[PDB]
Every structure is written in C-alpha cells, then in structure tokens.
C-alpha cells in the first residue's frame, strides 16, 4: 500500500508551453521506480518516463520526469498538440503497484460560449409517448458548464440526460447536449421547458427554452 497523487487533474495549455505535471509518493521513499504513462482516450497506456527520471525510447526528450522519492514531476517543456493526453505516474518500488490520479493536457485557447439549442421532443418521439427535450450546448470553451432544466418556472432535474463532446478537434471548444426526458403526459402537463447554460464565458446561464404552447 503506497499512494501517489498526480496534480493537476488537467492543465489547459499552449502547445510548446511548459506544463509540468507533479506527482508525489505518499509512502516510504519511492526513490526511483516511478514512471509516466501517457494514455490518450481509448488507448492502451503508453509509458513515457522511467525511474521517474528517464525517457522511454519512443517518447521524445520534451517529456521530462523529475522529482525524487516523496515528490515527483512530469515536465514537457514543449507540451504539444500531440502531447494532448492523460498522463499517469506509477510507483514501482513496492507491490502493490498503483497509479496516481492523472493530469490531463488540454490545449488552452479563446474562451467560447456554448451554442445552446433546445429541441422539443420530435413529433416522432411524442407519438411514442416518451418525450425527450434535447438541449445542445455547442462549441464552448472551456468545458466548464452547467445545464439547468426549468419547467413552468419550477426547475426540474429529473429526466435530464447530458452528453457532451470533448475538447473539440477543430476549435478545441466543447459541445454539450442536455436531454430532458419527460413522460409526454408530464411533458404536456407542464409547458415552459427551459435549459439554461451557465459557462465561464457567461456570467449568467445561456437560456434556451420553449413553452409547448408556443408553436
């Protein structure tokens, strides 16, 4: 039992900038035998630094692991768009073997507001008796955002289903979907269906709503 914690959890950065990813050995002196494992989403992990001090062969010298035995850092002095990833640090000094909660490389950019569009349930869906009010909060940077589904002025958190893109490959924004799924009965017993999106780009929620009585 030895714990590692790798800070931050994510860093929004310019590519080529130096974003150093800290780590620490909670126990003993781990000394050497810590690593850095880059795992991009949907990948097997990829080992970067070994003994906390040494690159693997494939990983270029931009990656630098550093720190000794109670504390550690993963540096990339030129973090890259190719370096966009999830990085891990792994104490090997003892079994059990474990992994610190990662740091992510996000590419910093202009802050973008979500394009927010609240589509009532398709008439196709309404004919099924189910009603899902979909609110698509699109192209926002950073990912910091929240959905609030307001119903007849009484905010409903139920039937809410959220699905959002990641840092968006072209603009590096994020896009989000907020789906308010109602029984068409309660969909019809209440009228104003309001998704409002608060985002670091907006001092207030970005309000997108429909009263079914409207069209």
Partner 1 sequence: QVQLMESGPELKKPGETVKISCKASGYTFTDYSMHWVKQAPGKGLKWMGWINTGTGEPTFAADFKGRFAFSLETSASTAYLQINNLKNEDTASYFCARGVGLYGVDYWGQGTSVTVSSPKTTPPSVYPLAPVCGDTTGSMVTLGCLVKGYFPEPVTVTWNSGSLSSGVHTFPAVLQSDLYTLSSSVTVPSSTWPSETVTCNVAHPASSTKVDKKIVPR
Partner 2 sequence: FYVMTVGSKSFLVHREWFHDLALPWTPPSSTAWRNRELLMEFEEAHATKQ
Partner 3 sequence: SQLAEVRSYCYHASVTDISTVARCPMTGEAHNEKRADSSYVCKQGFTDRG
Q: Which residues bind partner 2 (CB under 8 A)?
A: 1, 29, 31-33, 69, 93, 95-96
Residue 24 is a binding residue for partner 1 (CB under 8 A): no
Task: Tell which one of 44, 58, 153, 214 touches a second copy (CB under 8 A).
Answer: 153
Q: Which residue has the tokens 């590419």?
A: 107
Residue 151 is a binding residue for a second copy (CB under 8 A): yes
In whole angstroms, the minimum distance from the beta carbon of 72 to partner 1 comes to: 12
| Residue 39: φ, ψ to 5° | -125, 110
Task: Tell which one of 5, 28, 43, 70 touches partner 3 (CB under 8 A).
Answer: 28
Task: Tell which one of 42, 58, 61, 95 touches partner 3 (CB under 8 A).
Answer: 95
- Does residue 28 come out as left (phi exceeding 0), alpha (psi in the -120 to 50 range) or beta? left
- Does residue 69 come out as left (phi exceeding 0), alpha (psi in the -120 to 50 range) or beta? left
Q: Which does 151 bind (CB under 5 to 8 A by kind): a second copy, partner 1, partner 3, none?
A: a second copy
Residue 154 is a binding residue for a second copy (CB under 8 A): yes
Q: Which is nearer to a second copy, 40 or 148 (CB)?
A: 148
Residue 119 is a binding residue for partner 1 (CB under 8 A): yes
Residue 98 is a binding residue for partner 1 (CB under 8 A): yes
Residue 43: count other Cβ atoms within 10 Å of its Cβ: 10
In whole angstroms, the minimum distance from the beta carbon of 192 to a second copy comes to: 11
Name the residues that contact a second copy, by CB under 8 A. Answer: 151-154, 156, 189-190
């Amino acid at each position: 039992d030895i714990v590692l914690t790798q800070s931050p959890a994510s860093l929004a950065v310019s590519l080529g900038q130096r974003a150093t990813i800290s780590c620490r050995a909670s126990q003993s002196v781990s000394t050497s035998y810590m690593h850095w494992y880059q795992q991009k989403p949907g990948q097997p992990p990829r080992l970067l630094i070994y003994l906390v001090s040494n690159l693997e062969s494939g990983v270029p010298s931009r990656f630098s692991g550093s720190g000794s035995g109670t504390d550690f850092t993963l540096n990339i002095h030129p973090v890259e768009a190719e370096d966009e990833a999830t990085y891990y640090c792994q104490h090997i000094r003892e079994l059990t073997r474990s992994e610190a909660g990662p740091s992510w490389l996000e590419i910093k950019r202009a802050d973008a507001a979500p394009t927010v569009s609240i589509f009532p349930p398709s008439s196709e869906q309404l004919t099924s008796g189910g009603a899902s009010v979909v609110c698509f909060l699109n192209n926002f940077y950073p990912k910091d955002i929240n959905v609030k589904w307001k119903i007849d002025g009484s905010e409903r958190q139920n039937g809410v289903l959220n699905s959002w893109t990641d840092q968006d490959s072209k603009d590096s924004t994020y896009s989000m979907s907020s789906t308010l799924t109602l029984t068409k009965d309660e969909y019809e017993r209440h009228n104003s269906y309001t998704c409002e999106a608060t985002h670091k780009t907006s001092t207030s929620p970005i309000v997108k709503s429909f009263n079914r009585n409207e069209c």
